[PDB]
């Protein structure tokens, strides 16, 4: 779809501006990997617990969603 903004300023914007480099070691660049993942697999990446729940609830945010 060339070019993908609709993760980056979200996977940092959650609160993890120097995380997502560990993220993205696995792959989190694309939302569409994270679009399932969770806190469980979170702590599984072996990333620092700074923002791990953070993250988690952020991501369940996408499955949520808001309208209305």
């Given at each position: 779809?060339?070019?993908?903004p609709?993760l980056?300023?979200?996977?940092?914007?959650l609160?993890?501006?120097?995380?997502?480099?560990?993220?993205?070691?696995?792959g989190?660049?694309?939302?569409?990997?994270?679009?399932?993942?969770?806190?469980?697999?979170?702590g599984?990446?072996?990333?620092?617990?700074?923002y791990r729940?953070?993250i988690?609830?952020?991501?369940?945010?996408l499955?949520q969603?808001?309208?209305?």
């Amino acid at each position: 779809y060339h070019a993908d903004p609709s993760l980056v300023s979200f996977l940092t914007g959650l609160g993890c501006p120097n995380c997502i480099e560990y993220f993205t070691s696995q792959g989190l660049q694309s939302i569409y990997h994270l679009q399932n993942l969770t806190i469980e697999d979170l702590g599984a990446l072996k990333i620092p617990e700074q923002y791990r729940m953070t993250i988690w609830r952020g991501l369940q945010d996408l499955k949520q969603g808001h309208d209305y």
